[PDB]
Amino acid sequence: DVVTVELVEKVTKKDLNEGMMATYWCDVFDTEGKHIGTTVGCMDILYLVEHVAEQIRLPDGTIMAWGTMNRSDVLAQKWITYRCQGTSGRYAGLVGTRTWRIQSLESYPIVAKMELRGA
Amino acid sequence: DVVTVELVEKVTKKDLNESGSIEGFGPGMMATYWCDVFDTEGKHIGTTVGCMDILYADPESGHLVEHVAEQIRLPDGTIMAWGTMNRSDVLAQKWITYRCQGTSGRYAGLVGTRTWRIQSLEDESYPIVAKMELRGALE
């Protein structure tokens, strides 16, 4: 049985070291625009190919996600797929995908779709 | 066949959640950080960036259990590391074991462990010794 979560996330903070690297924070909203959690993440630009590892906190548990994105695909508003794994609460033990894209081609909020199930 | 890397890492920047961010909880629930990475001869050779989330308090103790995901950039490649730790163990200067895998360069294709310990709590950069041991994922 799949667990499915649709989110909207907006960046509130980003630090960079200008192989650029970054850390960031996002507000997480449900589809009704209600504020329900937070994402923290880090990024390293491998070759432009970026590699992300992040953690998402939701009212009922926590998830880690990770993956590799081409910068230009993000900017074309293509769907990016990260792998993810529940780390606590309702998501514990579950694995799946976090598929997301820039919602609006400015502040660049994203829509993200998480699907997890037993491993 | 085993690749071993020994580092010292020291925090240079940290941010934690602010009041009002996380409903019902104060700063401390989540963090991002940066560290300077040094070799065993003490030369500055790279950077680590990371994030932390509190999972829960251990009902058997009251101790905080946290989860970390981080990335380390070295002159010859990059590694991703992640894991859960009990903060009691960390502050007691026990050795903490995280999983890690290479993401580029010399470490591409490699998997193993990142075992670390705080070298000093007095030093507000909380220097750690980290020992990474990696082997080929391909059997």
Residue numbers in the entry:
A (entry chain B): 9 to 26, 36 to 64, 72 to 129, 132 to 145
B (entry chain A): 9 to 147
The article reads:
The hypothetical protein Cyc15 was found to catalyse an intramolecular cycloaddition to generate a novel spirotetronate. Cyc15 shares 28 % sequence identity with AbyU and was identified in the draft genome of Streptomyces sp. NL15‐2 K as a hypothetical protein. The overall fold of Cyc15 is analogous to those reported for other spirotetronate cyclases, possessing an eight‐stranded antiparallel β‐barrel fold with (+1) 8 topology. Mechanistic studies indicate that these enzymes accelerate [4+2] cycloadditions via an asynchronous concerted mechanism, consistent with a formal Diels‐Alder reaction.
